[PDB]
mmCIF file of C-alpha atoms and ligand atoms in Angstrom:
data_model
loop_
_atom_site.group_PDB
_atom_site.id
_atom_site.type_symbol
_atom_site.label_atom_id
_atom_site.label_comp_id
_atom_site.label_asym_id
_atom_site.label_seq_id
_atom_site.Cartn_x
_atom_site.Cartn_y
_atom_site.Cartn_z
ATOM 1 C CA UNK A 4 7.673 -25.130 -88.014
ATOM 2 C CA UNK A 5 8.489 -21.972 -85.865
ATOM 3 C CA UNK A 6 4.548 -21.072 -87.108
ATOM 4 C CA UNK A 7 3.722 -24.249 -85.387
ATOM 5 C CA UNK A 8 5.135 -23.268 -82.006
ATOM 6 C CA UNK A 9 3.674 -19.452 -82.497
ATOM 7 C CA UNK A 10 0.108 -20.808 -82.871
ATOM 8 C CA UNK A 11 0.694 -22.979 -79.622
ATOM 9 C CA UNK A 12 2.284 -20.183 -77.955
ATOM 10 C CA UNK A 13 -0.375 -18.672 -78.926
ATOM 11 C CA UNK A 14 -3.163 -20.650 -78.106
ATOM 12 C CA UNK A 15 -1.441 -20.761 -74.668
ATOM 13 C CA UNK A 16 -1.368 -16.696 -73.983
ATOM 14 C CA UNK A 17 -4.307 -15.244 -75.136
ATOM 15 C CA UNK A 18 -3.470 -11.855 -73.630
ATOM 16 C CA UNK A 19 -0.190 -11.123 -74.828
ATOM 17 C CA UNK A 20 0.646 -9.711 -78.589
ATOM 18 C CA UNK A 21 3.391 -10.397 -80.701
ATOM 19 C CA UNK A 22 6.030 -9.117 -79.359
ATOM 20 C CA UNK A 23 5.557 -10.661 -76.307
ATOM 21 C CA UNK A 24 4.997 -14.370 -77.683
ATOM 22 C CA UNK A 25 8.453 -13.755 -79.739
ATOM 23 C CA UNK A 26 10.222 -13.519 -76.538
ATOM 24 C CA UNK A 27 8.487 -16.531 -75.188
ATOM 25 C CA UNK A 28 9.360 -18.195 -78.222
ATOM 26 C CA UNK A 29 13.432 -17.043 -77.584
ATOM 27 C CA UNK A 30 13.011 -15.122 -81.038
ATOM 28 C CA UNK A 31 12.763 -11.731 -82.658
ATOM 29 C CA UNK A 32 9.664 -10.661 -83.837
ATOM 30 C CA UNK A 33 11.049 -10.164 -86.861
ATOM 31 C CA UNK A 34 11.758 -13.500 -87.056
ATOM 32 C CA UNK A 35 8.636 -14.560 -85.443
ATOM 33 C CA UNK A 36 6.983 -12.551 -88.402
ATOM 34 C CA UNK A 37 9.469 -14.071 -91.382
ATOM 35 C CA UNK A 38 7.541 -17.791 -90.068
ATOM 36 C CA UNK A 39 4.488 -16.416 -90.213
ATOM 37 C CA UNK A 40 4.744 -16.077 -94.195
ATOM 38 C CA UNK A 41 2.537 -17.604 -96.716
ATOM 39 C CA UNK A 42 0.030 -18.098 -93.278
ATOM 40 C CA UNK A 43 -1.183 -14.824 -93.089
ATOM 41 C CA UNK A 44 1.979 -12.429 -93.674
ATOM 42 C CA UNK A 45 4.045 -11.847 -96.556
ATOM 43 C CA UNK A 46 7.257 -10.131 -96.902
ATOM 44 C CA UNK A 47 7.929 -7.101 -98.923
ATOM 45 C CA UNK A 48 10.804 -5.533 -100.669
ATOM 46 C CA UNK A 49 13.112 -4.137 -97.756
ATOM 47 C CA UNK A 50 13.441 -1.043 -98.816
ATOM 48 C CA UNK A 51 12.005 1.427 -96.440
ATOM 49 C CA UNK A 52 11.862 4.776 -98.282
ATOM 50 C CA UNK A 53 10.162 3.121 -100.905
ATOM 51 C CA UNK A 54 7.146 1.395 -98.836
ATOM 52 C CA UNK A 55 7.195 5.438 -96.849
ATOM 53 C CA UNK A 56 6.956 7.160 -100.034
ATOM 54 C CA UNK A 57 4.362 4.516 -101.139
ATOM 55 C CA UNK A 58 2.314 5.247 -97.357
ATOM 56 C CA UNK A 59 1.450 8.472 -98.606
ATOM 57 C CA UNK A 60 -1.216 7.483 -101.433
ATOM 58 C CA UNK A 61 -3.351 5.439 -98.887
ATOM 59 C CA UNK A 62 -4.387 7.977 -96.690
ATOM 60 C CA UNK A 63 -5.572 8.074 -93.209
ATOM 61 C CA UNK A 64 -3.967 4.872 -91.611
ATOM 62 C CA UNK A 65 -2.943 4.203 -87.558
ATOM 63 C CA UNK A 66 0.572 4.639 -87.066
ATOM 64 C CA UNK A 67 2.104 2.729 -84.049
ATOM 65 C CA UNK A 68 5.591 3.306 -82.636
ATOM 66 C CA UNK A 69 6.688 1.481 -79.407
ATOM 67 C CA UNK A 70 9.552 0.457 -76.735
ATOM 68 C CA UNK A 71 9.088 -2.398 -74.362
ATOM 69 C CA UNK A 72 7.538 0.237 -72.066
ATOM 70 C CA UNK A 73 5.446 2.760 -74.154
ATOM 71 C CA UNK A 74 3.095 2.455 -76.917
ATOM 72 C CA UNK A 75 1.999 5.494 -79.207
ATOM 73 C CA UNK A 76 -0.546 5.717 -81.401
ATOM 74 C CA UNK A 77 -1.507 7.782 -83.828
ATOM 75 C CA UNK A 78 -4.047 8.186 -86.327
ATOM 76 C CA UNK A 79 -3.214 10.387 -89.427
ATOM 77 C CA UNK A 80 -1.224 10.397 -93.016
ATOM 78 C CA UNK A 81 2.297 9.888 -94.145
ATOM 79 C CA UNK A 82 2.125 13.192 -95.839
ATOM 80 C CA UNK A 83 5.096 16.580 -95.458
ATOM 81 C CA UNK A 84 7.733 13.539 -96.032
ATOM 82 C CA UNK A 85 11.440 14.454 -96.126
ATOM 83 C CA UNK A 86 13.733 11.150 -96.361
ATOM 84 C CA UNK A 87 16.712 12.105 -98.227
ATOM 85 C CA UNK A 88 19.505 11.249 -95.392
ATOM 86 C CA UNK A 89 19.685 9.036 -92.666
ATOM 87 C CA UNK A 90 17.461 11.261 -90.400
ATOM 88 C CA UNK A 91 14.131 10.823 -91.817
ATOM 89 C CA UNK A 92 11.527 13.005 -91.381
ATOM 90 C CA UNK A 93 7.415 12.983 -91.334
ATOM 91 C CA UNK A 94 6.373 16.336 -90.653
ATOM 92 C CA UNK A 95 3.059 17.063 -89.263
ATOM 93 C CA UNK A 96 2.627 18.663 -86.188
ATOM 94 C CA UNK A 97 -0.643 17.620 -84.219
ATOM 95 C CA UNK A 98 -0.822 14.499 -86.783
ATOM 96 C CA UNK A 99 1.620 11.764 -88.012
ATOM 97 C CA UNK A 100 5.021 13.061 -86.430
ATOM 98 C CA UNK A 101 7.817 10.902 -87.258
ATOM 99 C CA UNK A 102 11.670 11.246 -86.652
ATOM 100 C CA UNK A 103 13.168 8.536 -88.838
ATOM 101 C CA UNK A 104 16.953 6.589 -88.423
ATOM 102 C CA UNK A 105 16.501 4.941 -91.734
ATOM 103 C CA UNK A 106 20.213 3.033 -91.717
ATOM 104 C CA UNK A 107 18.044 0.930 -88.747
ATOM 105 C CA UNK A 108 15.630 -0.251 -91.218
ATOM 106 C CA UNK A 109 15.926 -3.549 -92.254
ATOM 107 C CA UNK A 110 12.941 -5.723 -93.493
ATOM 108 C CA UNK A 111 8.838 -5.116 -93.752
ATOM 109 C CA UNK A 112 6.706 -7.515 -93.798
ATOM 110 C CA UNK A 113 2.204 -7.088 -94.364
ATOM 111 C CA UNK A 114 0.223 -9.259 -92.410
ATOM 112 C CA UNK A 115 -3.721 -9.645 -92.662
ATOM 113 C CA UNK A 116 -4.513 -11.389 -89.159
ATOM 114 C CA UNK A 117 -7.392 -12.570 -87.253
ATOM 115 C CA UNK A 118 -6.750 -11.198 -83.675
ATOM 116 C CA UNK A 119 -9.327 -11.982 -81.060
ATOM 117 C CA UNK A 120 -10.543 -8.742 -81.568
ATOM 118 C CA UNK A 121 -11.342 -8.839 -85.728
ATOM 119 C CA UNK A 122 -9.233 -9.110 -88.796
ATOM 120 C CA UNK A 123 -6.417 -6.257 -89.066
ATOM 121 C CA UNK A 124 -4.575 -5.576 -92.117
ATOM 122 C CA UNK A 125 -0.807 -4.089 -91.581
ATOM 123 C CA UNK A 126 2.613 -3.340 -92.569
ATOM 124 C CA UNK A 127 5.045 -3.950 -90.442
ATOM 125 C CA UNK A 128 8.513 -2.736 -89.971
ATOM 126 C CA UNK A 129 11.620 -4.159 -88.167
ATOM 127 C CA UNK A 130 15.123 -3.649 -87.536
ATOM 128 C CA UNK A 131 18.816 -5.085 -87.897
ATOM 129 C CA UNK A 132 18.341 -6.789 -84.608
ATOM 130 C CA UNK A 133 14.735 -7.899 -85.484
ATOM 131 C CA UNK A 134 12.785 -5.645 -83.334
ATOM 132 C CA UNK A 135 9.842 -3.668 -84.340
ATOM 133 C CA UNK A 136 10.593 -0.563 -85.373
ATOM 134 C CA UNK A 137 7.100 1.413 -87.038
ATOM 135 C CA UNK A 138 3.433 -0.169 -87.562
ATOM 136 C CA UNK A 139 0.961 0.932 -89.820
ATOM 137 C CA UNK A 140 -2.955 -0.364 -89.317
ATOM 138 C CA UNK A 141 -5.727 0.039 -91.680
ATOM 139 C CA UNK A 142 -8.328 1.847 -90.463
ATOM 140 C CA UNK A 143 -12.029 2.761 -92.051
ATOM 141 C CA UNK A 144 -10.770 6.149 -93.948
ATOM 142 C CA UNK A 145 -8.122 4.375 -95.323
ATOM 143 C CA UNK A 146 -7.844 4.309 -98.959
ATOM 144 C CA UNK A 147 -8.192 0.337 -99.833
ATOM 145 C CA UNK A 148 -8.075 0.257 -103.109
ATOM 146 C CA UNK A 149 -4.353 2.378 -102.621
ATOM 147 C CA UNK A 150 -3.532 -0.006 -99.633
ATOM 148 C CA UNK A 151 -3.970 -3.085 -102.223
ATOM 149 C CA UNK A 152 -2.106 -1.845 -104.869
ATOM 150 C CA UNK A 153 0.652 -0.821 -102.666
ATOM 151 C CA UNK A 154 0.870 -4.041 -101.674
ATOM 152 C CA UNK A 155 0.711 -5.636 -105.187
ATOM 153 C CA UNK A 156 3.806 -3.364 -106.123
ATOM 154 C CA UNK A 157 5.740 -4.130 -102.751
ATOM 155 C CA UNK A 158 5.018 -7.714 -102.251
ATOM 156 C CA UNK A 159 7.694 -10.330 -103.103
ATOM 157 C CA UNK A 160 7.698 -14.195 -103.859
ATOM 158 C CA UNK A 161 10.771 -14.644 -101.499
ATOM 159 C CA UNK A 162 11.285 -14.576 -98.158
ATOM 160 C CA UNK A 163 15.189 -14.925 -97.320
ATOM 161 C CA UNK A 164 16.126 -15.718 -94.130
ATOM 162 C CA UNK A 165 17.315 -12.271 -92.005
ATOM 163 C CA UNK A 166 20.421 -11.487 -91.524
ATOM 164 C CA UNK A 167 20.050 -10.138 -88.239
ATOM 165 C CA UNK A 168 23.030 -8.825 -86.118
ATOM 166 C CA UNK A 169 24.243 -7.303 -82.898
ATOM 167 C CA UNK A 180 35.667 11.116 -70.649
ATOM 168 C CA UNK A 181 35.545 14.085 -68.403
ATOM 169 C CA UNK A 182 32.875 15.053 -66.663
ATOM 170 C CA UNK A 183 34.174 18.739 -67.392
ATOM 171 C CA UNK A 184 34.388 18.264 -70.716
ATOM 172 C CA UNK A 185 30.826 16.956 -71.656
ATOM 173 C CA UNK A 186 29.653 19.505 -69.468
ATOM 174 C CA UNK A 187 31.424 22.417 -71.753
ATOM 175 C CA UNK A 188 30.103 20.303 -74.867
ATOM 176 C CA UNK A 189 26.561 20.394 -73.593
ATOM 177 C CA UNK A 190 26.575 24.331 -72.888
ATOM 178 C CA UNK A 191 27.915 24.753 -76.810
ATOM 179 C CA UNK A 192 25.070 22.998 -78.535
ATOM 180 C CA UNK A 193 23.161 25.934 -80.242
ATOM 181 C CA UNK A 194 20.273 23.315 -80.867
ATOM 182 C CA UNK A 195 18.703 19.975 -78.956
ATOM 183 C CA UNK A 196 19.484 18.378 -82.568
ATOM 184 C CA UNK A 197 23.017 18.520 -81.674
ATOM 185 C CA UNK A 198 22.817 16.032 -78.551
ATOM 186 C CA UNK A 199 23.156 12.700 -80.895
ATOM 187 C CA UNK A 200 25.987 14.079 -82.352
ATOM 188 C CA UNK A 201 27.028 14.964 -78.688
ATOM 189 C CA UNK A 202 26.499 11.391 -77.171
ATOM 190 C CA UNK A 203 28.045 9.582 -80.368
ATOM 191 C CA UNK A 204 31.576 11.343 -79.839
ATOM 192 C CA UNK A 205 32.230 10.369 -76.171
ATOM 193 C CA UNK A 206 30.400 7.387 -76.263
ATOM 194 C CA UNK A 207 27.733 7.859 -73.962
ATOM 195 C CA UNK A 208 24.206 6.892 -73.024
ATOM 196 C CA UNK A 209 21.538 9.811 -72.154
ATOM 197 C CA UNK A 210 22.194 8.530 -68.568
ATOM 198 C CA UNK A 211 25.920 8.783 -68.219
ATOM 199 C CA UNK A 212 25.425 11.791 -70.332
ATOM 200 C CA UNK A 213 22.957 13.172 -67.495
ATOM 201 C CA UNK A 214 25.473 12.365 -64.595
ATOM 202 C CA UNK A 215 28.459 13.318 -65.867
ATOM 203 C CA UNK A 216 26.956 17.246 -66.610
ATOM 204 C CA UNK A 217 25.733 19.619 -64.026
ATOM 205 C CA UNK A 218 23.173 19.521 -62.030
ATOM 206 C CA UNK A 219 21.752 22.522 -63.814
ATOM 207 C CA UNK A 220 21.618 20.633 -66.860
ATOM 208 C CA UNK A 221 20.445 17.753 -65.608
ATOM 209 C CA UNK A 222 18.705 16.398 -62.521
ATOM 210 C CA UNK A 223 16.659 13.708 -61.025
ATOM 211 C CA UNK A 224 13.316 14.305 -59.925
ATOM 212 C CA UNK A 225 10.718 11.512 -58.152
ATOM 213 C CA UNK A 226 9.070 9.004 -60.495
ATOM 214 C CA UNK A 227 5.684 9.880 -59.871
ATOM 215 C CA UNK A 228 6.798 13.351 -62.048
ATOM 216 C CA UNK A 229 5.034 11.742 -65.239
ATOM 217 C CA UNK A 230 1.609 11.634 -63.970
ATOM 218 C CA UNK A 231 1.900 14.695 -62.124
ATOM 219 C CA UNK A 232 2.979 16.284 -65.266
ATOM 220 C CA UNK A 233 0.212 15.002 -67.439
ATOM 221 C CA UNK A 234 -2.663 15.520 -65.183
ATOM 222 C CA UNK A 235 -1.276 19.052 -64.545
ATOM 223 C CA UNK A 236 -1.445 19.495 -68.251
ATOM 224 C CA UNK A 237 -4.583 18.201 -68.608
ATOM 225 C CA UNK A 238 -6.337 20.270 -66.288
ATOM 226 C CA UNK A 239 -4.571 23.615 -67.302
ATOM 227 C CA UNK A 240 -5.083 22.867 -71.492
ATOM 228 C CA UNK A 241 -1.316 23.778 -72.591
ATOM 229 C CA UNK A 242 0.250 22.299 -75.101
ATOM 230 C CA UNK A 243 2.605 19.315 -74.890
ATOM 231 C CA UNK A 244 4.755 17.086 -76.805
ATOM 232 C CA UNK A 245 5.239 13.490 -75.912
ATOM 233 C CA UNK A 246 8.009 11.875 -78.258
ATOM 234 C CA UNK A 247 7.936 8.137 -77.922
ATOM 235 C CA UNK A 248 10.883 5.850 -79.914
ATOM 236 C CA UNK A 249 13.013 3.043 -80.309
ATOM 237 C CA UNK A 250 16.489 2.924 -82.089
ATOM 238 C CA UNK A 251 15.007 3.668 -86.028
ATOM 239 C CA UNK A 252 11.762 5.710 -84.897
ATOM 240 C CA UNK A 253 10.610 7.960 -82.756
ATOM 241 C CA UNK A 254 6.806 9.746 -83.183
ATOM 242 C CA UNK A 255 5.574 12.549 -81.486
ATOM 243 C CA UNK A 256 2.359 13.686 -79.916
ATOM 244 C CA UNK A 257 1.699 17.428 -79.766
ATOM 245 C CA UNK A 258 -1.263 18.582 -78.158
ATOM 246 C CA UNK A 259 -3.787 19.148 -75.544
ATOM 247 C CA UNK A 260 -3.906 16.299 -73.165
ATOM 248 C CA UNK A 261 -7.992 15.264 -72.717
ATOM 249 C CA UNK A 262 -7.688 12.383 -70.228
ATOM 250 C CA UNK A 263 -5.229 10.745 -68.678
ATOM 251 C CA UNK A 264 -6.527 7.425 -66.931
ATOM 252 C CA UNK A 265 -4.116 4.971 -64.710
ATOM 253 C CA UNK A 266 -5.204 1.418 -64.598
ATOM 254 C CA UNK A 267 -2.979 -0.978 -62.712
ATOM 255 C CA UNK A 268 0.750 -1.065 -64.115
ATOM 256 C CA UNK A 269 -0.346 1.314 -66.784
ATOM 257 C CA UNK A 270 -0.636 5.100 -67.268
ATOM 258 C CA UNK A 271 -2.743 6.175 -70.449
ATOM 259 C CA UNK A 272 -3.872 9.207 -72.217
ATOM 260 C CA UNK A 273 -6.548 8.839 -74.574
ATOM 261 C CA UNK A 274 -7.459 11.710 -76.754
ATOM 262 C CA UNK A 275 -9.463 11.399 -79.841
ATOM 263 C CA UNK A 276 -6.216 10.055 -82.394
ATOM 264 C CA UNK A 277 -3.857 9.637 -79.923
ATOM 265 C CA UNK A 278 -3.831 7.156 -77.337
ATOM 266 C CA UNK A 279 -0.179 6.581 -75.228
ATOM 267 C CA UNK A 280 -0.197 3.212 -73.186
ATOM 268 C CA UNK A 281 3.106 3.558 -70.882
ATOM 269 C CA UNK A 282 3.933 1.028 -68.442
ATOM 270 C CA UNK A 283 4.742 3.466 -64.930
ATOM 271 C CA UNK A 284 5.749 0.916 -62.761
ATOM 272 C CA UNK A 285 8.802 0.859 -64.910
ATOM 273 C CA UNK A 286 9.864 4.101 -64.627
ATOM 274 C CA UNK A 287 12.890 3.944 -62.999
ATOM 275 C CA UNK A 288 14.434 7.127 -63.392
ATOM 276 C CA UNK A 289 13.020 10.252 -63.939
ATOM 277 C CA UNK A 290 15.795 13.220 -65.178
ATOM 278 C CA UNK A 291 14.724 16.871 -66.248
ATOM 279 C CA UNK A 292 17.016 17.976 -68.426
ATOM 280 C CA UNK A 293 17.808 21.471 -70.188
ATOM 281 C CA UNK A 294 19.335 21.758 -73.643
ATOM 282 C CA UNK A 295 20.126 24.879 -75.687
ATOM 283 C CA UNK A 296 18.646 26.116 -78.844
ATOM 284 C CA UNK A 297 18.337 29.834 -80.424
ATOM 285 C CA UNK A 298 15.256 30.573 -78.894
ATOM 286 C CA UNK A 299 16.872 30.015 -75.430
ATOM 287 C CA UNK A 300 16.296 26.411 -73.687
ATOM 288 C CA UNK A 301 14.570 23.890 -73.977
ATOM 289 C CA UNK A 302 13.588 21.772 -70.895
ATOM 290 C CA UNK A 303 11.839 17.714 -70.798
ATOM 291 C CA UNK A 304 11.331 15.389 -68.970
ATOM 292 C CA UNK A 305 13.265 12.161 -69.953
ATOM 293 C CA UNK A 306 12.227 8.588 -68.369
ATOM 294 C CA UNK A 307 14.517 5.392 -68.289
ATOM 295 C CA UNK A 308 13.738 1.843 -67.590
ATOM 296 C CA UNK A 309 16.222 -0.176 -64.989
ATOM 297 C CA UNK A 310 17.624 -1.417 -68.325
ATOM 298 C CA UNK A 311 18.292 1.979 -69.986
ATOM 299 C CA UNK A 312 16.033 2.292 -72.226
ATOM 300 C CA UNK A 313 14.458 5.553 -72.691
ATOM 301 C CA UNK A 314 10.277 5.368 -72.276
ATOM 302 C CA UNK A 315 9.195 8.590 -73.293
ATOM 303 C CA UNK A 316 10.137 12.412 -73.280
ATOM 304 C CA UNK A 317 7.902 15.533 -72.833
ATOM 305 C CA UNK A 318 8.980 19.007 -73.534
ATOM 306 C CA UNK A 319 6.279 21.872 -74.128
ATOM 307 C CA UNK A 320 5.266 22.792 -77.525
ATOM 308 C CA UNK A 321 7.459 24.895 -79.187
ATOM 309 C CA UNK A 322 7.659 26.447 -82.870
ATOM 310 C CA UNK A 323 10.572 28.493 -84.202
ATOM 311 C CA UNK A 324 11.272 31.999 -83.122
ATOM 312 C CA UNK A 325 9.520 31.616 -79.861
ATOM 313 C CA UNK A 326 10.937 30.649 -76.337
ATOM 314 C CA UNK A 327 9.799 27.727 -74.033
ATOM 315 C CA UNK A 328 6.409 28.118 -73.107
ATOM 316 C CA UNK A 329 6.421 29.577 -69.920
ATOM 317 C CA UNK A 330 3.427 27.528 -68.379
ATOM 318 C CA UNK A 331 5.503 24.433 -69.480
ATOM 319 C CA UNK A 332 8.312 26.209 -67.523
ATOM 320 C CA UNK A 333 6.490 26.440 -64.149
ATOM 321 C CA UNK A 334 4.808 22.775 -64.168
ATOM 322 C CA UNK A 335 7.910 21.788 -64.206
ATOM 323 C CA UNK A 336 9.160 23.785 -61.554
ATOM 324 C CA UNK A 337 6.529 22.185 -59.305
ATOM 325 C CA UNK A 338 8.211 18.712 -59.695
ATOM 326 C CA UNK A 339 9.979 17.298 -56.687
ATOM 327 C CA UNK A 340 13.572 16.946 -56.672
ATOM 328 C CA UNK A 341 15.245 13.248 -55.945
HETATM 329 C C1 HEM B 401 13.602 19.937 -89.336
HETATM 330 C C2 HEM B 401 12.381 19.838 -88.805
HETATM 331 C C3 HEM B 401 12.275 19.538 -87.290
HETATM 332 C C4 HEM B 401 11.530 20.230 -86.413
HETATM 333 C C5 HEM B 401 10.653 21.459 -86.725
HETATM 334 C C6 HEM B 401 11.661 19.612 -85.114
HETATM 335 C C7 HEM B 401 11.085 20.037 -83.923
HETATM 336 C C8 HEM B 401 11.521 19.636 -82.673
HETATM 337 C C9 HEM B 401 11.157 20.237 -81.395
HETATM 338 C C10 HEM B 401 10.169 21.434 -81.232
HETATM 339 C C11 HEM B 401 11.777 19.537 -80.428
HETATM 340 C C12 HEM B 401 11.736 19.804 -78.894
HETATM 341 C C13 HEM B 401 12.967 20.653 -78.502
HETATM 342 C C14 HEM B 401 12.798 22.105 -78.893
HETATM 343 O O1 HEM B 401 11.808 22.762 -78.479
HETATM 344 O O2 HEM B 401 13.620 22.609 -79.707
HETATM 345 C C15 HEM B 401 12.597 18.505 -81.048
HETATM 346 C C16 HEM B 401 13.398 17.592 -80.400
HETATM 347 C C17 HEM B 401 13.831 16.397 -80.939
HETATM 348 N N1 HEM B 401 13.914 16.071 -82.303
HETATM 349 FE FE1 HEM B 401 13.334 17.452 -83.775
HETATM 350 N N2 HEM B 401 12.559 18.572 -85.229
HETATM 351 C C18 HEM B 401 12.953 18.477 -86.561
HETATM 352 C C19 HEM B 401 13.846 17.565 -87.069
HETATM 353 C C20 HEM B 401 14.273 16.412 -86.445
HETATM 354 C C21 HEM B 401 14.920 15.262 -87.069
HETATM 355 C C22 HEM B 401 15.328 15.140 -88.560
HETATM 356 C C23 HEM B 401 15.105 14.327 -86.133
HETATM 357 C C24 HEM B 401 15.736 12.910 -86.282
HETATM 358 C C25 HEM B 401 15.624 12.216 -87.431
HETATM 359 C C26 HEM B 401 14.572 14.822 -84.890
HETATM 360 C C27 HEM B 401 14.552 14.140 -83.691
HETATM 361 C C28 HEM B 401 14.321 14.744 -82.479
HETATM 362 C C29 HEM B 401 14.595 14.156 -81.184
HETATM 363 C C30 HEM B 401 15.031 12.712 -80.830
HETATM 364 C C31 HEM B 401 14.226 15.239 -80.178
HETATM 365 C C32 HEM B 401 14.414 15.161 -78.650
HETATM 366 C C33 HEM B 401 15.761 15.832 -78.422
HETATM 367 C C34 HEM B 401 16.298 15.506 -77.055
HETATM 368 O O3 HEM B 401 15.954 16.206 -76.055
HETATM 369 O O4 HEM B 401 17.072 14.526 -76.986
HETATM 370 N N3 HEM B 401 14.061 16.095 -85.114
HETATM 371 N N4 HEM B 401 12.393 18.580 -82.419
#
């Protein structure tokens, strides 16, 4: 049926993944995935923690997070795991860094597919409004014979369909200088019903300002040629996975800005950068300064801030690449 169309969809777009035949398609890819069942995907239990909990047996895996405009991958273990609440965490600094909003978890499916590139074995995880949400690839460390009987526990017969579903300026300001810690900004937005942009323009400019949207790859060449550490946090509405690190090599190829560093590769679309905000939040330690990029629609592509670790201010090199950003 809806397979039928993927495969000529398919067929007719040899360059473009999933995702982007779902929206050819007018569908999820959740959806797109739920017709791909008993062809070479089947669904699993829906029940998030569980498959997470489950991740950690099968070792070394590639862990793939992504918005429409950035892609992060990752290679490491579901290991330091700390899910009790709706903000999950994976906790592994360097390696498989996850920041979890479990209430947007709502189905997983496994697929074993031949790509024009090989056969790929995954588990796949999508939200309420049947976007993709978290990926996890097999790789050659991983343990198989784990992987399979994950699976065999996880796996179910049915495959229902998816229920899939839909003010001073002063005052923020004063709200923003009160946070004792970044964490606090959700918490922050969620009260006066905000986005991070309207957020951003409603504060000070001290606390928020544009700069020019060639600031990313200025940043991440200047970090790649002085060796400090970074962070790069890449999410969507139920995941977000971070990158800490010494950037290697950044390489720009058309449309596309990359880093590629030995398990972490970041493919971000720059041409659709269309705003580019440095922003400064509070913590303990003193503040905490990143660079935040939005799409024309909103969406937030990425986020760098320098590494950081308890009991220790912003990195000062961080501090002064930043400075060397142009305003506007
Ligand atoms: C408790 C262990 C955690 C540690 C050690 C940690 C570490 C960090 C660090 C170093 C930053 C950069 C800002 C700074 O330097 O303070 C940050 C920001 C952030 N964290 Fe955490 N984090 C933790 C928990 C969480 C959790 C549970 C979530 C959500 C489920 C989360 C989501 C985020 C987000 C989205 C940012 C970016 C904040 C912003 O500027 O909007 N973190 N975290």
């Amino acid at each position: 049926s809806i397979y039928e169309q993927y495969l000529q969809a398919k067929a007719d777009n040899p360059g473009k993944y999933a995702r982007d035949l779902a929206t050819l398609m007018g569908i999820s890819e959740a959806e797109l995935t739920h017709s791909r069942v008993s062809h070479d995907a089947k669904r699993l239990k829906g029940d998030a923690r569980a498959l997470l909990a489950a991740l950690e047996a099968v070792g070394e895996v590639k862990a793939i997070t992504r918005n429409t405009y950035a892609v992060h991958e990752q290679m490491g273990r579901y290991e330091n795991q700390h899910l009790n609440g709706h903000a999950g965490l994976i906790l592994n600094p360097r390696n498989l860094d996850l920041r979890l909003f479990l209430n947007q978890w709502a189905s997983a499916f496994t697929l074993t597919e031949e790509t024009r590139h090989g056969v790929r074995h995954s588990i796949q995880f999508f939200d309420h409004q049947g976007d993709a949400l978290h990926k996890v690839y097999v790789t050659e460390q991983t343990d198989m014979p784990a992987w399979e009987a994950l699976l065999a526990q996880f796996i179910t017969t049915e495959n229902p369909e998816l229920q899939l579903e839909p003010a001073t300026d002063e005052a923020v300001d004063a709200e923003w200088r009160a946070m004792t810690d970044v964490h606090e900004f959700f918490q922050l937005l969620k009260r006066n019903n905000l986005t991070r942009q309207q957020a951003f323009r409603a504060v000070g400019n001290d606390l928020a300002y544009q700069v020019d949207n060639s600031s990313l790859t200025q940043l991440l060449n200047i970090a790649q040629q002085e060796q400090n550490e970074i962070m790069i946090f890449v999410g969507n509405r139920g995941c977000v996975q971070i990158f800490t690190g010494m950037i290697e090599k950044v390489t720009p190829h058309q449309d596309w800005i990359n880093v590629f560093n030995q398990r972490f590769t970041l493919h971000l679309i720059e041409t659709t950068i269309a705003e580019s905000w440095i922003t400064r939040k509070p913590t303990k330690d003193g503040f905490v300064t990143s660079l935040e990029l939005f799409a024309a629609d909103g969406t937030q592509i990425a986020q760098l801030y320098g590494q950081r670790t308890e009991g220790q201010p912003e990195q000062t090199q961080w501090r002064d690449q930043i400075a060397r950003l142009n305003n506007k």
